[PDB]
Design a protein around this ligand. Structure first.
Ligand SMILES: Nc1ccn([C@@H]2O[C@H](COP(=O)(O)CP(=O)(O)OP(=O)(O)O)[C@@H](O)[C@H]2O)c(=O)n1
Lengths: 229, 114, 76, 199, 146
DNA sequence: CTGTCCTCTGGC
DNA sequence: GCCAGAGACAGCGAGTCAGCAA
RNA sequence: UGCUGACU
């Protein structure tokens, strides 16, 4: 009885779903648009990468791609694609992202130019602002900081701005994952870094000869990503 | 019978399910069987109001916005499929939630949505 | 000039279909067929040799298009 | 002395809201604890703050904390006068029970001359922007929206919509017709970026 | 062409408890070397018991005269001086060499895992005398009781 | 056999 | 003008084979 | 078209 009734309800649910999400196709600019052009997503899975091809891009499947590297390059990508790849635009972007995240370990700490010009906090609290009340609701000691910062600082060399600027925007956002080599997702490159560090420290104690280098495995993984798109 | 001394609007009962984690077993959760988001904002020192979750998706969409209701929709579909061992890929629920919440509101996927 | 350089699988399918429907309508085969009676096998033989004078006209969602050559397209 | 805890939470939340809009706020205000808030400041007319903008030093904002639990048209006029005389354009009215319904369309009626905005007191007890599920919103500049529309060959309609009464469009004070960038922390791709036209 | 030669003695007939049908896993231990051997042996063809000795050799060629092996099996080969002083001959490949765990210690011992179709062997002992091995290398395991 | 409409109706 | 009373009202899996009566 | 059986 339950089988019959369950199928009766599931058929209708699926018909409704299919009748609303049917016109959503990936476009030549990698954006998921509806029939009238309305942008639903700016990247299919939030990174592209249709499902069936992302099965071996998980970690724990790299020791397989590394073991079968010669077959994978000969059978699919080949030496032709590996050397017809130019990764500079995307590689520099990830270097910038890494430097930023190196200077800002806590990424929820309210970065700001003026906020960065609160290190004199002790300089002000010591003796300067000891005499006032809440003039316009702010403080007696906040007004001294406002005065020192506002126009008593350099014209164009008051660059507390650079110490407090946004993280570069993700690479897939700026560098067109399809036609741009090495432009991958921020969660894939982390996995690749972790695996390269845990794989260069296995070759050292391997009693087998490995003719693959960390920087050929990296290009292999980057091509296998760019092609699962 | 329908005369109640006093109650928080929308909440019918609370309960502290002592343990919810093994990794950091020390976690405690104050589950509820009603829904009133603002009537918990007064306890930001007793309870963690970041990490607040509800299955309503219309109440989340009214206290936190639509980009926060997208993820509640996705997590709800995932937890519905999880009770049977089924596991749909996140790339599908992402598209379904992005389409449902396209035009600023949680719109039903039915005859009035067309 | 900005779309992907490779030939999507849908493009390969449609190009093979069209080349086959042309061959079948008595079109000259530039591939030196070797005794095969299938026009689709001949179309694949031509695609592998990079002899197909067709222009894939990729349409963008706003009407703008880009004209690619079947020769200037990386077939996987 | 719970009124003071509520006042302190609301003041901290409003300082964070003013810093997220790009107003000159010091670290001490953003890191002010209760013991020192109550040390400084009791009332509901000396909690009023006046903040300046990073650029456009004339462009400043004024936060009100009306006494009337239900603000009315007269209460709105009494300090629209204050704003008009002190020569400011923006305001922010934190109300304790609500605004009588005619007032909401009056605040709207005041043309860009003096643009005001209301916030309930229970809406400011916590910073929704600090929830796990709420992404980071960034009001795009008029020259970035053009480049976006040019890169995707879009129109401003045909973009996802964010309601003008959205709890995170009211917080970031985004007017209608503005596009906001949204950085979703995605478990799949890390830092997905989306765009929504405020309407 | 020998890579290893020694005289073992069976200590355990099958400790793990996994029991297969015609195969028995012997846990031996060398003499005068104190090397260890785990050896799956087909006991329907070659019965082995406890407290039993046997001379064991690992080679890379059966000719014992230098000429390499061709990787092809002929039961018709006319060179018949291949090692036949041995009753049980196998033929497998080494698939894993792993230096021992101990760090901060000499611990220059190696465990060589050989597969003989499906019958695994593990030779553990001083690396000094397990150098001839290398992963993916074909080897013959000749044995002869005593 | 359920959930929204959704168009009254009706009272206030 | 504020929001209950409803009271209509619309939806309810896919395909296939027969016979019999009107 | 209808209705009564039946199949996955
Ligand atoms: N009304 C129906 C009845 C059946 N079907 C279809 O027939 C399949 C097999 O039915 P089934 O009843 O044989 C189930 P199965 O798991 O194969 O049975 P078992 O346990 O004995 O092996 C179902 O799974 C549906 O796809 C349908 O579409 N509508």
């Amino acid at each position: 009885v339950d089988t019959a009734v369950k199928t009766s309800r599931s058929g209708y649910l699926q018909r409704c779903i299919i009748k609303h999400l049917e016109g959503l196709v990936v476009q030549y600019d990698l954006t998921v648009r509806d029939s009238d052009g309305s942008v639903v997503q700016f990247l299919y899975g939030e990174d592209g990468l249709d499902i069936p091809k992302t099965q071996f891009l998980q970690p724990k499947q790299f020791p397989f791609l590394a073991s079968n590297y010669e077959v994978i390059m000969k059978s699919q990508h080949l030496h032709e694609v590996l050397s017809r790849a130019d990764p500079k635009k995307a590689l520099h972007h990830f270097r910038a992202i890494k430097k930023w995240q190196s200077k800002h370990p806590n990424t929820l700490l309210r970065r700001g130019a003026f906020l960065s010009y609160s290190q004199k906090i002790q300089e002000a609290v010591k003796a300067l602002k000891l005499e006032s009340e809440n003039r316009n609701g702010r403080s007696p000691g906040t007004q001294e900081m406002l005065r020192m910062w506002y126009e008593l600082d350099e014209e164009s060399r008051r660059k507390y701005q650079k110490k407090a600027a946004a993280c570069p925007d993700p690479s897939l956002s700026v560098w067109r994952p399809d036609i741009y080599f090495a432009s991958v997702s921020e969660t894939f490159e982390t996995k690749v870094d972790d695996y390269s560090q845990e794989w260069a420290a296995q070759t050292e104690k391997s009693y087998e000869k490995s003719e693959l280098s960390l920087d050929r495995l990296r290009t292999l993984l980057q091509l296998k990503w760019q092609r699962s798109l | 019978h329908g005369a109640v001394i006093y109650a928080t609007k929308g909440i019918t009962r609370c309960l502290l399910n002592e343990t919810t984690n093994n990794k950091n077993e020390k976690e405690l959760v104050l589950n509820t069987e009603g829904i009133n988001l603002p009537e918990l904002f007064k306890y930001a020192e007793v309870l963690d109001l970041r990490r607040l979750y509800s299955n309503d998706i219309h109440a989340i969409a009214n206290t936190y916005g639509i980009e926060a209701a997208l993820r509640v929709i996705e997590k709800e579909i995932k937890d519905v499929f999880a009770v049977y061992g089924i596991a749909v890929d996140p790339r599908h629920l992402s598209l379904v939630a992005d389409y449902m919440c396209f035009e600023g509101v949680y719109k039903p996927l039915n005859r009035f949505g067309i | 000039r900005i779309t992907t350089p490779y030939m999507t699988k849908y493009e390969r399918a449609r190009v093979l279909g069209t080349r086959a429907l042309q061959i079948a309508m008595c079109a000259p085969v530039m591939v030196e067929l070797e005794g095969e009676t299938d026009p689709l096998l001949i179309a694949m033989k031509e695609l592998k040799a990079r002899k197909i004078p067709i222009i894939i006209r990729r349409y963008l969602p706003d009407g703008s298009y880009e004209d690619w050559g079947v020769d200037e397209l990386i077939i996987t | 002395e719970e009124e003071t805890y509520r006042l302190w939470k609301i003041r901290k939340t409003i300082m964070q809201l003013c810093h997220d809009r790009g107003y000159l706020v010091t670290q001490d205000e953003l890191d002010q604890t209760l013991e020192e808030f109550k040390a400084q400041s009791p009332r509901r007319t000396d909690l009023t703050v006046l903040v300046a903008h990073n650029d456009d030093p004339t462009d400043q904002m004024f936060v009100f904390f009306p006494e009337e639990p239900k603000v009315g048209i007269k209460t709105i006029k009494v300090y629209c006068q204050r704003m008009q005389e002190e020569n400011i354009t923006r305001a922010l009215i934190v109300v304790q029970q609500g605004m009588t319904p005619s007032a909401k369309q009056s605040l709207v009626d005041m043309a860009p001359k003096y643009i005001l905005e209301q916030f309930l007191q229970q809406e400011l007890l916590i910073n929704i922007t600090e929830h796990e599920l709420v992404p980071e919103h960034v009001v795009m500049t008029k020259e970035e929206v053009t480049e976006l529309l040019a890169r995707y060959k879009l129109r401003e309609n045909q973009l996802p919509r964010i309601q003008a009464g959205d709890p995170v469009a009211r917080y970031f004070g985004i007017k209608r017709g503005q596009v906001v960038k949204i950085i979703r922390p995605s478990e799949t791709a890390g830092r997905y970026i989306t765009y929504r036209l405020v309407q | 062409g020998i890579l290893f030669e020694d005289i073992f003695d069976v200590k355990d007939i099958d400790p793990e408890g996994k029991k297969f049908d015609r195969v028995s896993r012997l846990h031996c231990e060398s003499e005068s070397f104190k090397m260890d051997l785990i050896l799956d042996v087909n006991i329907q063809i070659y019965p082995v018991d406890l407290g039993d000795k046997f001379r064991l050799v690992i080679a890379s060629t059966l000719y014992e005269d230098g000429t390499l092996d061709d990787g092809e099996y002929n039961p018709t080969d006319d060179r018949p001086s291949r090692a036949d002083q041995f009753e049980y001959v196998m033929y497998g490949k080494v698939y894993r060499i792993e230096g021992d765990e101990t760090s901060t210690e000499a611990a220059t011992r190696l465990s060589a895992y050989v597969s003989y179709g499906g019958l695994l062997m593990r030779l553990q002992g001083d690396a000094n005398n397990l150098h001839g091995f290398e992963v993916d290398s074909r080897v013959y395991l000749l044995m002869k009781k005593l």
